Protein backbone atom coordinates (compact mmCIF):
# COMPACT_ATOMS: atom_id res chain seq x y z
CA UNK A 1 0.00 0.00 0.00
CA UNK A 2 2.98 2.43 0.84
CA UNK A 3 4.78 3.48 -2.09
CA UNK A 4 6.39 6.82 -3.47
CA UNK A 5 6.53 7.39 -7.10
CA UNK A 6 9.52 9.50 -8.94
CA UNK A 7 9.27 11.82 -11.95
CA UNK A 8 11.57 10.80 -14.62
CA UNK A 9 15.72 10.87 -15.64
CA UNK A 10 16.11 14.76 -16.17
CA UNK A 11 19.01 16.30 -18.56
CA UNK A 12 19.81 19.53 -17.89
CA UNK A 13 22.61 22.05 -19.28
CA UNK A 14 24.44 23.61 -16.22
CA UNK A 15 23.57 26.48 -14.37
CA UNK A 16 20.02 25.65 -15.14
CA UNK A 17 17.39 24.46 -12.22
CA UNK A 18 15.48 21.67 -12.16
CA UNK A 19 12.17 20.49 -10.01
CA UNK A 20 11.94 16.70 -8.95
CA UNK A 21 8.33 15.11 -7.66
CA UNK A 22 8.15 12.37 -4.81
CA UNK A 23 4.33 11.37 -5.36
CA UNK A 24 3.44 9.22 -1.83
CA UNK A 25 -0.03 7.05 -1.73
CA UNK A 26 -1.38 4.83 0.92
CA UNK A 27 -1.02 6.62 4.07
CA UNK A 28 -1.26 9.89 5.91
CA UNK A 29 1.39 12.49 3.68
CA UNK A 30 0.93 15.29 6.61
CA UNK A 31 2.28 13.26 9.42
CA UNK A 32 5.23 11.24 7.94
CA UNK A 33 8.46 13.07 7.32
CA UNK A 34 10.25 12.90 3.40
CA UNK A 35 13.83 13.00 3.65
CA UNK A 36 16.07 13.44 0.49
CA UNK A 37 19.28 11.85 -0.52
CA UNK A 38 21.61 11.68 -2.92
CA UNK A 39 23.91 9.83 -4.62
CA UNK A 40 26.72 10.36 -6.97
CA UNK A 41 29.27 7.42 -7.62
CA UNK A 42 32.25 7.10 -5.32
CA UNK A 43 30.13 9.54 -2.93
CA UNK A 44 28.09 6.84 -0.86
CA UNK A 45 24.46 8.21 0.17
CA UNK A 46 24.15 12.04 1.28
CA UNK A 47 21.59 13.33 3.23
CA UNK A 48 20.07 16.43 1.76
CA UNK A 49 17.57 17.35 4.21
CA UNK A 50 13.29 16.79 4.56
CA UNK A 51 10.50 18.41 4.79
CA UNK A 52 6.98 17.33 7.07
CA UNK A 53 4.57 17.96 4.31
CA UNK A 54 1.80 20.41 6.09
CA UNK A 55 3.74 20.89 9.34
CA UNK A 56 7.15 22.06 11.05
CA UNK A 57 8.23 21.83 7.52
CA UNK A 58 12.09 21.73 6.88
CA UNK A 59 15.90 20.83 7.55
CA UNK A 60 18.33 21.12 5.61
CA UNK A 61 22.05 19.85 5.45
CA UNK A 62 24.36 23.14 5.74
CA UNK A 63 25.76 22.33 2.67
CA UNK A 64 23.34 22.06 0.56
CA UNK A 65 20.96 25.39 1.23
CA UNK A 66 20.70 27.44 -1.40
CA UNK A 67 21.01 24.59 -3.89
CA UNK A 68 18.08 22.54 -2.60
CA UNK A 69 14.51 23.53 -1.99
CA UNK A 70 11.78 21.47 -0.54
CA UNK A 71 8.35 21.82 -0.65
CA UNK A 72 4.74 19.27 -0.59
CA UNK A 73 1.88 19.49 -1.91
CA UNK A 74 -1.10 18.45 -0.31
CA UNK A 75 -3.90 18.30 -2.21
CA UNK A 76 -1.70 16.47 -5.08
CA UNK A 77 0.32 14.49 -1.66
CA UNK A 78 3.30 15.41 -3.71
CA UNK A 79 7.10 16.24 -2.35
CA UNK A 80 9.26 18.21 -4.17
CA UNK A 81 12.79 19.39 -4.86
CA UNK A 82 14.30 22.01 -6.57
CA UNK A 83 17.95 21.93 -7.43
CA UNK A 84 19.13 25.30 -8.65
CA UNK A 85 22.69 26.42 -10.41
CA UNK A 86 23.18 22.81 -11.56
CA UNK A 87 26.67 21.51 -12.19
CA UNK A 88 28.45 18.28 -13.16
CA UNK A 89 28.76 17.99 -9.08
CA UNK A 90 24.93 17.70 -9.29
CA UNK A 91 25.17 14.87 -11.76
CA UNK A 92 23.85 12.43 -9.31
CA UNK A 93 20.92 9.87 -8.72
CA UNK A 94 18.31 11.54 -5.95
CA UNK A 95 16.24 9.55 -4.39
CA UNK A 96 13.03 10.83 -1.81
CA UNK A 97 12.06 8.26 1.12
CA UNK A 98 9.66 7.98 4.11
CA UNK A 99 10.96 8.80 7.45
CA UNK A 100 9.18 9.20 10.83
CA UNK A 101 5.61 10.39 11.86
CA UNK A 102 4.54 11.58 15.23
CA UNK A 103 2.59 8.36 16.07
CA UNK A 104 4.34 5.89 14.16
CA UNK A 105 7.55 4.41 12.64
CA UNK A 106 8.84 1.33 11.89
CA UNK A 107 11.84 1.82 9.00
CA UNK A 108 10.99 3.54 5.86
CA UNK A 109 10.28 3.47 2.46
CA UNK A 110 12.35 4.35 -0.39
CA UNK A 111 11.33 5.94 -3.67
CA UNK A 112 12.64 3.80 -7.46
CA UNK A 113 15.58 7.03 -7.56
CA UNK A 114 15.65 10.02 -10.21
CA UNK A 115 18.57 10.39 -12.28
CA UNK A 116 19.76 13.91 -13.07
CA UNK A 117 22.72 14.36 -15.84
CA UNK A 118 23.74 17.47 -16.07
CA UNK A 119 25.81 18.58 -19.09
CA UNK A 120 26.30 20.63 -22.30
CA UNK A 121 26.65 17.60 -24.36
CA UNK A 122 24.59 17.23 -27.50
CA UNK A 123 23.16 14.14 -28.67
CA UNK A 124 25.36 12.28 -30.80
CA UNK A 125 25.78 8.47 -31.96
CA UNK A 126 28.89 6.65 -31.28
CA UNK A 127 31.41 5.61 -33.99
CA UNK A 128 32.46 1.98 -33.48
CA UNK A 129 35.62 0.77 -33.84
CA UNK A 130 37.18 -2.57 -34.17
CA UNK A 131 39.10 -4.08 -31.42
CA UNK A 132 40.93 -6.96 -33.21
CA UNK A 133 42.57 -10.22 -31.97
CA UNK A 134 46.24 -11.02 -32.73
CA UNK A 135 46.66 -14.96 -32.66
CA UNK A 136 45.32 -17.18 -35.96
CA UNK A 137 46.74 -20.76 -34.71
CA UNK A 138 47.36 -23.62 -32.11
CA UNK A 139 44.73 -25.75 -32.29
CA UNK A 140 42.27 -24.00 -30.51
CA UNK A 141 44.41 -20.98 -28.88
CA UNK A 142 42.25 -18.14 -26.78
CA UNK A 143 42.51 -14.90 -28.97
CA UNK A 144 40.67 -11.49 -27.46
CA UNK A 145 38.83 -9.20 -29.78
CA UNK A 146 36.22 -6.63 -29.35
CA UNK A 147 34.58 -3.52 -30.34
CA UNK A 148 35.09 0.49 -28.84
CA UNK A 149 32.07 2.11 -28.90
CA UNK A 150 33.25 5.54 -28.87
CA UNK A 151 31.91 9.26 -28.55
CA UNK A 152 28.53 9.33 -28.00
CA UNK A 153 25.58 11.15 -25.61
CA UNK A 154 23.83 10.63 -23.76
CA UNK A 155 23.47 7.23 -21.83
CA UNK A 156 23.23 4.48 -22.45
CA UNK A 157 23.95 2.00 -25.42
CA UNK A 158 23.50 -1.46 -25.76
CA UNK A 159 25.46 -4.16 -27.15
CA UNK A 160 25.61 -7.71 -28.08
CA UNK A 161 28.04 -10.27 -30.25
CA UNK A 162 26.30 -12.04 -33.10
CA UNK A 163 22.76 -10.68 -32.00
CA UNK A 164 22.90 -12.75 -29.02
CA UNK A 165 23.98 -15.98 -29.65
CA UNK A 166 27.28 -15.32 -28.32
CA UNK A 167 27.10 -14.23 -24.68
CA UNK A 168 29.84 -16.92 -23.22
CA UNK A 169 32.88 -14.52 -22.48
CA UNK A 170 31.66 -11.86 -23.03
CA UNK A 171 32.53 -8.47 -20.95
CA UNK A 172 31.10 -5.03 -21.72
CA UNK A 173 32.42 -2.21 -19.62
CA UNK A 174 30.80 0.64 -17.65
CA UNK A 175 30.66 3.49 -19.93
CA UNK A 176 33.41 6.28 -19.28
CA UNK A 177 32.73 10.15 -19.39
CA UNK A 178 35.18 11.59 -21.64
CA UNK A 179 37.22 14.91 -21.30
CA UNK A 180 35.41 15.90 -24.10
CA UNK A 181 32.44 15.53 -22.53
CA UNK A 182 31.03 12.18 -24.22
CA UNK A 183 31.03 8.59 -23.47
CA UNK A 184 33.09 5.63 -24.49
CA UNK A 185 32.64 1.96 -23.70
CA UNK A 186 34.14 -1.38 -24.59
CA UNK A 187 32.54 -4.74 -24.98
CA UNK A 188 35.08 -7.62 -25.23
CA UNK A 189 35.06 -11.30 -26.04
CA UNK A 190 37.22 -14.00 -25.92
CA UNK A 191 37.30 -16.65 -28.10
CA UNK A 192 39.07 -20.03 -29.38
CA UNK A 193 42.00 -19.24 -31.37
CA UNK A 194 41.19 -21.90 -34.12
CA UNK A 195 37.80 -20.23 -34.96
CA UNK A 196 39.29 -17.11 -35.94
CA UNK A 197 39.96 -17.95 -39.20
CA UNK A 198 36.57 -19.94 -39.40
CA UNK A 199 34.13 -17.83 -37.27
CA UNK A 200 33.27 -14.01 -37.80
CA UNK A 201 32.20 -12.38 -34.74
CA UNK A 202 29.98 -8.82 -35.48
CA UNK A 203 28.94 -6.78 -32.38
CA UNK A 204 25.19 -5.04 -32.30
CA UNK A 205 25.70 -1.32 -30.93
CA UNK A 206 22.32 0.25 -30.64
CA UNK A 207 22.11 4.31 -28.89
CA UNK A 208 18.43 5.27 -29.22
CA UNK A 209 18.71 8.55 -28.18
CA UNK A 210 20.24 9.04 -31.40
CA UNK A 211 18.61 6.03 -33.14
CA UNK A 212 22.09 4.59 -34.18
CA UNK A 213 21.89 1.14 -35.14
CA UNK A 214 25.52 -0.60 -36.02
CA UNK A 215 26.47 -4.01 -36.48
CA UNK A 216 30.40 -4.29 -36.62
CA UNK A 217 32.34 -7.45 -38.07
CA UNK A 218 35.57 -8.01 -35.69
CA UNK A 219 38.16 -9.69 -38.10
CA UNK A 220 42.34 -10.25 -37.48
CA UNK A 221 44.17 -8.13 -39.34
CA UNK B 1 28.00 17.71 11.81
CA UNK B 2 28.04 13.76 13.53
CA UNK B 3 31.15 12.02 11.64
CA UNK B 4 30.17 8.63 11.35
CA UNK B 5 33.50 6.47 10.67
CA UNK B 6 32.31 2.86 9.03
CA UNK B 7 34.80 0.11 8.84
CA UNK B 8 35.71 -2.28 6.72
CA UNK B 9 35.59 0.27 3.54
CA UNK B 10 35.27 -2.74 1.31
CA UNK B 11 35.70 -6.76 2.36
CA UNK B 12 35.75 -10.10 0.55
CA UNK B 13 33.74 -12.64 2.49
CA UNK B 14 32.48 -16.48 1.95
CA UNK B 15 29.20 -17.97 2.12
CA UNK B 16 28.62 -18.70 5.83
CA UNK B 17 30.46 -16.52 7.26
CA UNK B 18 29.57 -14.13 10.02
CA UNK B 19 30.41 -10.63 8.76
CA UNK B 20 30.26 -7.91 11.25
CA UNK B 21 30.20 -4.04 10.03
CA UNK B 22 30.97 -1.16 12.09
CA UNK B 23 29.87 2.15 12.71
CA UNK B 24 31.20 4.54 15.17
CA UNK B 25 30.07 7.99 15.82
CA UNK B 26 31.84 11.29 17.13
CA UNK B 27 29.09 11.93 19.75
CA UNK B 28 27.03 9.96 21.45
CA UNK B 29 23.49 9.13 19.23
CA UNK B 30 21.20 7.21 21.76
CA UNK B 31 20.78 4.51 19.36
CA UNK B 32 18.92 6.74 16.22
CA UNK B 33 21.13 4.76 13.85
CA UNK B 34 19.64 2.84 10.55
CA UNK B 35 21.60 0.14 8.46
CA UNK B 36 20.47 0.55 4.88
CA UNK B 37 21.30 -2.23 2.22
CA UNK B 38 22.12 -1.04 -1.45
CA UNK B 39 22.87 -3.74 -4.29
CA UNK B 40 23.97 -2.43 -7.83
CA UNK B 41 20.78 -0.33 -9.65
CA UNK B 42 18.08 -0.53 -7.52
CA UNK B 43 17.71 2.12 -4.67
CA UNK B 44 18.76 1.66 -0.84
CA UNK B 45 16.80 -0.20 1.11
CA UNK B 46 16.28 0.05 5.38
CA UNK B 47 17.19 -3.05 7.31
CA UNK B 48 17.53 -1.93 10.82
CA UNK B 49 16.20 0.93 12.46
CA UNK B 50 16.59 2.72 16.23
CA UNK B 51 20.39 0.18 16.00
CA UNK B 52 18.39 -3.05 16.72
CA UNK B 53 15.18 -3.11 15.24
CA UNK B 54 14.54 -5.52 12.34
CA UNK B 55 12.43 -3.77 9.50
CA UNK B 56 9.68 -6.09 9.23
CA UNK B 57 10.53 -8.40 6.16
CA UNK B 58 13.84 -8.31 6.49
CA UNK B 59 15.40 -11.61 7.16
CA UNK B 60 16.71 -12.72 10.60
CA UNK B 61 20.31 -13.49 9.57
CA UNK B 62 20.43 -9.63 9.82
CA UNK B 63 20.58 -7.62 13.15
CA UNK B 64 22.11 -4.82 14.77
CA UNK B 65 23.68 -3.64 18.04
CA UNK B 66 25.14 -1.21 19.94
CA UNK B 67 25.22 2.29 22.19
CA UNK B 68 26.35 5.18 22.92
CA UNK B 69 28.93 5.37 20.23
CA UNK B 70 29.97 2.32 18.88
CA UNK B 71 27.32 0.25 16.70
CA UNK B 72 27.29 -3.01 14.37
CA UNK B 73 25.43 -4.45 11.89
CA UNK B 74 26.29 -8.55 11.46
CA UNK B 75 24.86 -10.76 8.61
CA UNK B 76 25.01 -14.00 10.72
CA UNK B 77 25.20 -16.32 7.76
CA UNK B 78 26.43 -14.86 4.52
CA UNK B 79 24.57 -15.39 1.50
CA UNK B 80 24.98 -14.48 -2.15
CA UNK B 81 22.36 -11.75 -2.36
CA UNK B 82 24.02 -10.14 0.34
CA UNK B 83 26.66 -8.72 -1.60
CA UNK B 84 26.07 -5.05 -2.28
CA UNK B 85 27.02 -1.99 -0.02
CA UNK B 86 26.31 -0.57 2.85
CA UNK B 87 25.24 2.39 5.09
CA UNK B 88 24.55 3.67 8.62
CA UNK B 89 22.91 6.69 9.10
CA UNK B 90 22.49 8.42 11.94
CA UNK B 91 19.11 10.47 12.84
CA UNK B 92 19.40 11.98 16.49
CA UNK B 93 21.06 15.45 15.40
CA UNK B 94 20.83 17.70 12.17
CA UNK B 95 22.49 17.50 10.20
CA UNK B 96 21.77 13.37 9.71
CA UNK B 97 24.81 11.78 8.10
CA UNK B 98 25.86 8.52 6.28
CA UNK B 99 28.72 6.69 6.73
CA UNK B 100 31.05 6.18 3.80
CA UNK B 101 29.84 3.07 3.25
CA UNK B 102 31.06 -0.85 3.31
CA UNK B 103 31.43 -2.92 -0.11
CA UNK B 104 30.99 -6.73 0.72
CA UNK B 105 31.99 -8.78 -2.01
CA UNK B 106 32.66 -12.53 -2.52
CA UNK B 107 36.06 -13.84 -1.59
CA UNK B 108 37.29 -16.92 -3.91
CA UNK B 109 41.20 -17.61 -4.87
CA UNK B 110 43.88 -15.19 -6.58
CA UNK B 111 43.80 -15.49 -10.30
CA UNK B 112 46.39 -13.18 -12.38
CA UNK B 113 44.77 -11.12 -15.36
CA UNK B 114 45.72 -12.58 -18.72
CA UNK B 115 46.62 -9.43 -20.80
CA UNK B 116 46.11 -8.29 -24.36
CA UNK B 117 46.69 -4.35 -25.92
CA UNK B 118 45.00 -3.30 -29.07
CA UNK B 119 46.86 -0.89 -31.27
CA UNK B 120 44.60 1.81 -32.77
CA UNK B 121 42.08 0.64 -35.74
CA UNK B 122 43.42 2.49 -39.42
CA UNK B 123 39.54 2.90 -39.03
CA UNK B 124 39.76 5.91 -36.16
CA UNK B 125 43.19 6.95 -37.20
CA UNK B 126 41.36 8.00 -40.36
CA UNK B 127 39.54 10.05 -37.68
CA UNK B 128 42.53 12.03 -36.28
CA UNK B 129 42.32 10.12 -32.97
CA UNK B 130 44.04 7.11 -31.64
CA UNK B 131 42.95 4.69 -28.43
CA UNK B 132 44.90 2.50 -27.45
CA UNK B 133 43.51 -0.56 -25.34
CA UNK B 134 44.74 -2.45 -22.57
CA UNK B 135 42.53 -5.54 -21.51
CA UNK B 136 43.27 -7.30 -17.77
CA UNK B 137 41.13 -10.63 -18.56
CA UNK B 138 39.14 -12.81 -15.43
CA UNK B 139 41.32 -11.61 -12.28
CA UNK B 140 40.91 -11.34 -8.74
CA UNK B 141 41.56 -9.82 -6.35
CA UNK B 142 40.22 -6.78 -7.71
CA UNK B 143 43.11 -4.22 -7.20
CA UNK B 144 45.42 -4.23 -9.84
CA UNK B 145 47.71 -1.09 -11.53
CA UNK B 146 47.81 -0.42 -14.87
CA UNK B 147 50.91 2.09 -16.44
CA UNK B 148 51.20 3.12 -20.14
CA UNK B 149 54.81 3.54 -21.61
CA UNK B 150 54.79 5.06 -24.91
CA UNK B 151 58.37 5.01 -25.94
CA UNK B 152 60.11 5.08 -22.74
CA UNK B 153 57.82 7.78 -21.59
CA UNK B 154 55.49 7.08 -18.29
CA UNK B 155 51.85 8.31 -19.42
CA UNK B 156 49.88 10.45 -16.95
CA UNK B 157 46.39 11.07 -17.13
CA UNK B 158 45.67 10.68 -20.54
CA UNK B 159 43.86 7.46 -20.04
CA UNK B 160 40.34 6.19 -18.28
CA UNK B 161 40.43 2.82 -16.22
CA UNK B 162 36.54 0.80 -16.63
CA UNK B 163 35.79 -2.40 -14.41
CA UNK B 164 33.04 -5.21 -14.87
CA UNK B 165 31.27 -6.58 -11.53
CA UNK B 166 32.39 -9.71 -10.02
CA UNK B 167 31.12 -12.24 -12.15
CA UNK B 168 28.46 -14.20 -11.41
CA UNK B 169 29.83 -17.54 -12.92
CA UNK B 170 33.73 -16.95 -11.36
CA UNK B 171 33.47 -14.11 -9.35
CA UNK B 172 36.23 -12.43 -11.47
CA UNK B 173 36.57 -9.12 -12.21
CA UNK B 174 38.19 -7.99 -15.96
CA UNK B 175 39.42 -4.40 -16.24
CA UNK B 176 40.10 -2.22 -19.78
CA UNK B 177 42.43 0.72 -20.33
CA UNK B 178 42.19 3.33 -22.62
CA UNK B 179 45.12 5.52 -23.70
CA UNK B 180 43.80 8.55 -25.90
CA UNK B 181 46.63 10.30 -28.52
CA UNK B 182 46.15 12.43 -30.93
CA UNK B 183 46.90 10.54 -34.66
CA UNK B 184 49.77 13.08 -34.91
CA UNK B 185 51.39 11.83 -31.69
CA UNK B 186 50.75 8.59 -32.43
CA UNK B 187 52.65 8.29 -35.49
CA UNK B 188 55.36 10.23 -33.46
CA UNK B 189 56.27 7.43 -31.52
CA UNK B 190 56.97 3.44 -32.08
CA UNK B 191 56.78 0.97 -28.96
CA UNK B 192 52.79 1.40 -27.05
CA UNK B 193 53.19 -0.85 -24.14
CA UNK B 194 51.05 -1.42 -20.68
CA UNK B 195 52.43 -2.80 -17.76
CA UNK B 196 50.27 -4.58 -15.58
CA UNK B 197 50.83 -4.81 -11.54
CA UNK B 198 48.83 -7.32 -9.78
CA UNK B 199 48.97 -9.87 -6.71
CA UNK B 200 48.83 -12.82 -9.11
CA UNK B 201 51.74 -12.11 -11.13
CA UNK B 202 55.00 -12.63 -9.19
CA UNK B 203 56.15 -9.91 -11.17
CA UNK B 204 55.29 -6.96 -13.74
CA UNK B 205 53.36 -8.34 -17.52
CA UNK B 206 54.05 -6.08 -20.14
CA UNK B 207 52.11 -6.58 -23.81
CA UNK B 208 53.33 -3.86 -26.43
CA UNK B 209 53.27 -3.33 -30.30
CA UNK B 210 55.34 -1.38 -32.39
CA UNK B 211 53.46 1.44 -34.20
O1 LIG C 1 11.28 15.33 17.88
C1 LIG C 1 12.12 14.41 17.93
O2 LIG C 1 13.46 14.59 18.27
C2 LIG C 1 11.80 12.97 17.61
C3 LIG C 1 10.80 12.28 18.57
C4 LIG C 1 10.62 10.76 18.27
N1 LIG C 1 11.28 10.43 16.97
C5 LIG C 1 11.54 9.20 16.43
O3 LIG C 1 11.21 8.14 16.99
C6 LIG C 1 12.26 9.14 15.12
C7 LIG C 1 12.90 10.31 14.60
C8 LIG C 1 13.57 10.28 13.37
C9 LIG C 1 13.61 9.06 12.59
C10 LIG C 1 14.38 9.07 11.21
C11 LIG C 1 14.96 7.63 10.86
C12 LIG C 1 15.73 7.63 9.50
C13 LIG C 1 14.82 8.16 8.33
C14 LIG C 1 15.59 8.17 6.99
C15 LIG C 1 15.56 7.02 6.13
C16 LIG C 1 16.25 7.02 4.89
C17 LIG C 1 16.97 8.19 4.48
C18 LIG C 1 17.00 9.34 5.31
C19 LIG C 1 16.31 9.34 6.55
C20 LIG C 1 14.20 9.56 8.71
C21 LIG C 1 13.44 9.55 10.05
O4 LIG C 1 12.90 10.87 10.30
C22 LIG C 1 12.97 7.89 13.09
C23 LIG C 1 12.30 7.94 14.34
Known amino acids: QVQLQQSGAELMKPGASVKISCKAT????????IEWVKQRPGHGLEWIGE????????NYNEKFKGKATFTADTSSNTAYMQLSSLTSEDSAVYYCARGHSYYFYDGDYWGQGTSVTVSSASTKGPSVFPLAPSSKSTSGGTAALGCLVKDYFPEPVTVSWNSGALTSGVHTFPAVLQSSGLYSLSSVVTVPSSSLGTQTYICNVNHKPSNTKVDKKVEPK | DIKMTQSPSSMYASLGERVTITCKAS??????LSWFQQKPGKSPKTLIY???RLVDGVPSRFSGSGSGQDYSLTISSLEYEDMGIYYCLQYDEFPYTFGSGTKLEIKRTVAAPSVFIFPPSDEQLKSGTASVVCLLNNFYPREAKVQWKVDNALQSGNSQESVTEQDSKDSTYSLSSTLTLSKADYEKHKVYACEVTHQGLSSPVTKSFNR
Open chain 1, 51 to 58: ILPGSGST
Open chain 1, 26 to 33: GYTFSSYW
Open chain 2, 27 to 32: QDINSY
Open chain 2, 50 to 52: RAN
